[PDB]
Subunit: 498 residues, 4 copies
């Protein structure tokens, strides 16, 4: 039997695992060490969670290696790996209310959105990839013939083997799902590190894999310190790939560590400063609605949020009046209250960073139109904010808030290429967008924008079939889509002579 | 007008550029510095070659950058880019004897082999990749629809931008062309660092890009020091991809610097210790021919040369006897002479290295059945060598020689799984092969071998359409085939709502 | 409520629909016309079944058209259409014991096989294709830019629309599943025509689509005379694709009909005379079992069965001696009994042709080693048959039997192209096989065989991922695999200038 | 030596073969039968051309079948096949002035346009398809494993064999180039039947294949009666694929014949009546330019000609007036005059049909704004024509004219779905267009149009990489694009057990 932290909320009896998941069992960390996970709604401790040690990482991994090399996962039909992954998806759906509640407690996700998206997309993610398992194909290739002889050349797609994935705290389960589904669809086994601040949906997902019959060893979760577990996953000789989403500096270190050990393959999503250009000839109310969302969605803790809105001169003031009208209507509150629109930031230290951030924006000269402060109520809520008169040299033009702060700039009537470089000046390139009703503009603007995603007349419109990843200092590699699969596959060439 | 080093050799008149190619002109390095390049057939100094300085690397990068962003190459149709690359290939052909002659002098490549393979394949590459330009396609993806609205999602494959590629010395022009043709075809610009010890066909090549009409600044070439130029390209914040083939420790470092600067994408080809497994049921005469070749091809300076031969008990002795018989017959000598089937080694330091290498095999217990020493003639020639009684723990069973040293162990009659396991006991994984007439062992062994390429009843049969790359510590990324392009393209997702 | 035929048998209580399925409701045919369906184990009348007339064909088409054009199926996400098909597969799984049993009474399929294979594969078929729904992608293409402007070119894969599929009687549910599942996955709607002699499992399937939530009109089934429904569907101006499996004469007329109406798309799969070539170096006992199965599986009623076995002189006599011993251990009997392994032929008329066929086999000079006659018992059973001494010019060497008739020819030891030649001297070309331990023989033999599928050391090894169709007069077009989707999709090219 | 018709014209001495081209040699038809080919600039006989008889067809097929089965074309590497086809484009380039004059003579194509587009695009198509040869690739597929044994499934893509292709007269060289290039690229051989009224460029083409090194018998050409040649090819037992482009009645008959003989494969491109919908928010003047071209290009002799312009009510009259302004500026005359805009129709009988068509438009109530007549001068000119007040039931609203006839209908402001019905109420569906500055209608009208090509803010912008073909009664199959290659290839699934 599994030890749970029981807790009655949202009409529910939650049963939450709080330990390391290694080898298909929940165990305490070495020397029973633990740490506190914190509910951002009121500041309380939710419980104590195991704190992984170097020798626990070694066990997660030995188990991942054994499951891959000798266990069932590596011996069964691609189609059957499909079945299992599609079953895990049914289980996740059977437990959806419970997972969205846990994600609301653990991470401050407004409960309606945690159902429809955090958990909703998690489920689509496994179901999509399960589809791929028996549809991953190699090639036969018509090479030159060694006459008087004959040659056949074919390629076999194979799994890379044991993989370490490190997940961010903005959407704990969904991001777990994005990287894990693809990784396992390709026939790998995995050691997962959820962020230190958000371990709970990972741990419950762990248990679901048991409920789903996924073979002992295939999934191993290690909550705890990022630089203890992330570091060792990178150095380890039996790990062949690291998937990393997170901060830039930590990214660089990770790739560096991958290089120094065994030249493991590495993915990196290091956030962004995504531009959104809004011309005069767009549909303005809709630009307001979608503009607001491009910033405020999931309390701005969103690696592709619009980090700079460039609004055409002649509609700028009208756009700002309208955004202010609508911001006053958002309902800030507890994530479990059904009428809540805008919930807490994820943890305390981020709320501090948000405060410091808008302090500095005011200092350096920008115009603060609303918000900027902690909301006066318990927990870690932050007021939806709007800056105008942002000039390209300001820190709030260069830096990623990861919070609900709308940073607006003007550009001149009909002045396309100039606004284009302003928008391209960054060393990020994770996403971008443009609103206009003119087709020429839209097409042209999407060619020139130096970002991995261009949204046209919509925003935050990701999908499990559509690949996701940045250019430049946002990193490289994709999550979601056929393309995702390639990070977790290796290609073998086989050339016969006969 | 271009300065040349003129030489009457091989019934032609080589006219060799010897300088830096930067932005369309041959120029001297900073401070007019130069180094000598040496002819391995006689020990003499072919000529003086510019020695590239940090400020030159930067000038080469700035010109690659201008050409990508504001040059014609970035404006022209994909079809016309293809045209230009087919032209280049025609020019290369028109100069085939000169290029193979240059390569004979600079690298010691036997002229016939050079003409057929080094240059032949080179020309095939540019031809192959030429036809890819206007067939590089993206996708349209049926995403869930934001009803009542509609969504179109598509992808654009786009060039990554300024690239830097670092070429080894074993097939100077060929290796250059494997990497450049793919890079160029995807629409990038390039800065190429050929090995210090082999700069010559790379500068001739550069002159040819001029004959071909490749716009100024698309190709730039920088002979010089490996660390000086490699390190600078790795750090430069305008470079976005490194392609690298070379030694383990250098590669790791390259990958490190890529991480610590701007998360530039990277590729690593790091050689191997490739196992070749020979079963008593193969055609034995053919196995001696192909087996010998698997080692001695291009005097062993070959990244997928067979590092270890495992030969079945029942035929081990008859197999050795026959190899020895056939080695006696090889004419070693001047690469320019028609009779010659074995050139000198590339350079002096690699020859001394092969000498230490075989002493070391003897000290540790392996039988030295022939060769082992420098051939007593001018230049840097090495004896085709054969070792037997080689135990799994020996240094020469683990380390990559890069020379003509066939290294043979036995295995037990019947013992399939056992041998696979010893063949897989390396942290290399570049290539492998199996000889046998049995369909069942061939398919099974090819599954179980842990390497990027598996040759079945042939060896060294690469082709411009078949992807080439390692697993484990041989690195990652592919040269050749369609897969090679994915290394030099990026995917932008455009998602419209309407 | 639905009118059933109830039947207690095999320890279940069968509930079998028996009417036209049209617009999601079972209805009687024009003027209440009916015909009888005969149990082949005993010749009795299972029941009356509706007899579709012309006005019914139009009603079914008119329903499919409305459901494609205005109903949910043409409006939902590709992703969700996936879910409906995975759901249909789970419903078929839930009624699996019952479907196997209807297939036993209706088609004389041995129960244990009907369950593992007819039903089994049918489930995989819907699971596999449900997978494709949202992995069906078009392209983005790099056309020449109309300077000084820009062009964008993409392709959208769209459904074809209303399809008619005509299903054979050999594996009724399975072959329905084959063509239906791909058709639906691509977003089409369908009118299905099962074989006059095997309507039952189709009609029960029609009911299960109700349980799965498939919108009304998407599936429609019309039992009846093949030549009336078949005729009308292929004439109808609102049907845009016929998928057909059946005989040459009928297939031909159908294609002719598609042309004279509205130039509908067609696929044709017209049977086979598949050569199996058995080499002396093969594993003789496996060769015998796989040989047995190659002819006897599903009492030979199988478009891909080995209709000639060529055996190498040195092992011919020993092969026949063994085949005969095995033929003799075959238990013949009621498909419902656990220990039966050779059930009755599908229907009387077919049984009669099998009789006529061996009459001519004997008349024309072939040695009849065993069987070749109706088993004396009731219903329609036929005796496992083996002919040896078959000469190329003979009727039984040219015409497909589609019964359990093994037809053997010698070929001279070591004569490969000569037998290849004989194996290819047919206007069929649907499948083939070679048994041999020689990789070289195996690979060469598979190049040279003029056939849609080549098996190597196995036979009847179809898989839902592996495309299935013939060359020459056996047809064109694939079932199964990614290739299947192509027969049911159109490609639209969109070219913008901007 | 070949027999020429020598003509000094357009500063050149043309050398025009006039014989049948069978097996690499030009020859008279059976009993030397000939027919004349008429210059439509002045109605003069150009010269007499051989007239293919049945025996002749058979000879050509046999020469193709021999070349495919046993000749060089069949044994070479796909890469070497690529090369020859590239050489073929080069020879055509060197002859490009000559071919364009020949086409100006035989087809009345304006010389400037024959050079740039008729011949230019031909040159492109060969170049395009040459690149595809060594890049046509099969699959390796993850099927379920027959445990404890193992399985390998792969697909080989192979040629179909002898093809027959029937070429229309409107762009004789170009159309021939379209089908022949992909056909040859895929590995097959061919009998090409040019239009009876336009043999000359096809025959000049055949000479060129000689110069190019195409093996004797890969390309066979048979000028003469359409019924005689095309009908024989369709029934021939040794032909395996027909590619047909022309008229609906002849197309239907062709498909029928493929069915009746051996179920050979068939493509049909059967013309269009393609709608071009112009919205009031377009650029008015670009619309009048692109609009005029959409109809008048190549004298209206164009399968994707805009057969109806639907102009939004509010901009109609301004549009019709501007169009009249511009039609009066078009210069009419000799195809060799370098300032000609509009040349003669292709032949008398078509001129005569243009005349009748226009009478009929007026008779049924449409408004003749200009033209609708033979231009009085020698040869077969027809006036550029504008019709207005066209209504949905009229004959000229339904029938394809294939002449230079603008047929305009108004449509009510701010309806969109209602103009789509009108644009879709034809049984043609080859092409279509939308002019609009508004992205939302553009993307939506592109989905909704039932045609194989949608131009958006441009027209007639085909391209060798972009697939061309029809839906509904326009036929099926593609020319141009990767997807054309699959009309000419078959797939072999090969399945191992081991």
């Amino acid at each position: 039997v599994i030890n749970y932290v029981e807790k009655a909320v949202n009409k529910l009896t939650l049963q939450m695992p709080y330990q390391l998941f290694i080898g298909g069992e929940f165990v305490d960390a070495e020397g029973s060490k633990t740490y506190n996970t914190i509910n951002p709604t009121d500041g309380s401790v939710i419980c104590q969670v195991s704190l992984a040690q170097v020798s626990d990482v070694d066990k997660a991994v030995a188990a991942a290696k054994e499951a891959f090399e000798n266990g069932l996962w590596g011996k069964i039909n691609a189609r059957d790996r499909g079945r299992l992954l599609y079953r895990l998806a049914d289980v996740m759906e059977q437990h959806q209310e419970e997972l969205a509640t846990i994600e609301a407690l653990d991470a401050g996700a407004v409960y309606t959105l945690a159902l429809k998206t955090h958990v909703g997309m998690s489920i689509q993610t496994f179901r999509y990839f399960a589809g791929w398992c028996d549809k991953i194909q190699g090639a036969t290739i018509p090479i030159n013939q060694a006459r008087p002889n004959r040659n056949l050349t074919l390629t076999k797609k194979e799994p890379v083997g044991v993989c370490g994935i490190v997940i961010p705290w903005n959407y704990p389960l969904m991001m777990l799902s994005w990287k894990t589904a693809a990784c396992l669809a390709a026939g790998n086994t995995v050691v997962i590190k959820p962020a230190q601040v958000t371990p709970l949906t990972a741990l419950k997902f762990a248990e679901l894999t048991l409920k789903a019959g996924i073979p002992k060893g295939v999934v191993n979760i290690l909550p705890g310190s990022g630089s203890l577990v992330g570091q060792r996953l990178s150095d380890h000789p039996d790990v062949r790939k690291i998937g990393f989403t997170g901060s830039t500096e930590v990214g660089k270190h990770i790739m560096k560590s991958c290089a120094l050990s065994n030249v493991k393959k590495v993915s990196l999503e290091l956030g962004g400063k995504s531009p959104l250009i809004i011309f005069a000839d767009c549909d303005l109310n809709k630009a307001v609605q979608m503009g607001m969302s491009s910033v405020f969605f999931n309390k701005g803790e969103n690696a592709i949020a619009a980090g700079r809105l460039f609004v055409e001169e002649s509609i700028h003031n009208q756009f700002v009046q309208k955004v202010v009208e609508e911001v006053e209507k958002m309902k800030i509150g507890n994530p479990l209250e059904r009428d809540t629109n805008h919930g807490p930031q994820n943890h305390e230290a981020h709320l501090r960073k948000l405060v410091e951030y808008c302090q500095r924006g005011v200092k350096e000269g920008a115009t603060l139109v609303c918000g900027g402060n902690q909301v006066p109520r318990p927990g870690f809520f932050f007021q939806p904010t709007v800056f105008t008169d942002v000039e390209d040299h300001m820190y709030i033009a260069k830096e990623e808030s990861f919070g609900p702060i709308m940073i607006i700039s003007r550009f001149a009537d009909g002045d396309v290429d100039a606004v284009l470089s302003r928008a391209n000046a960054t060393e990020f390139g994770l996403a971008s967008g443009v609103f206009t009703r003119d087709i020429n503009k839209a097409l042209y603007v999407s060619d020139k924008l130096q970002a991995g995603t261009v949204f046209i007349n919509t925003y935050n419109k990701t999908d499990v079939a559509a690949p996701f990843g940045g250019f430049k200092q946002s990193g490289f590699g994709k999550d979601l889509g056929e393309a995702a699969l390639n990070e977790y596959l290796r290609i073998k060439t086989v050339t016969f002579e006969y």
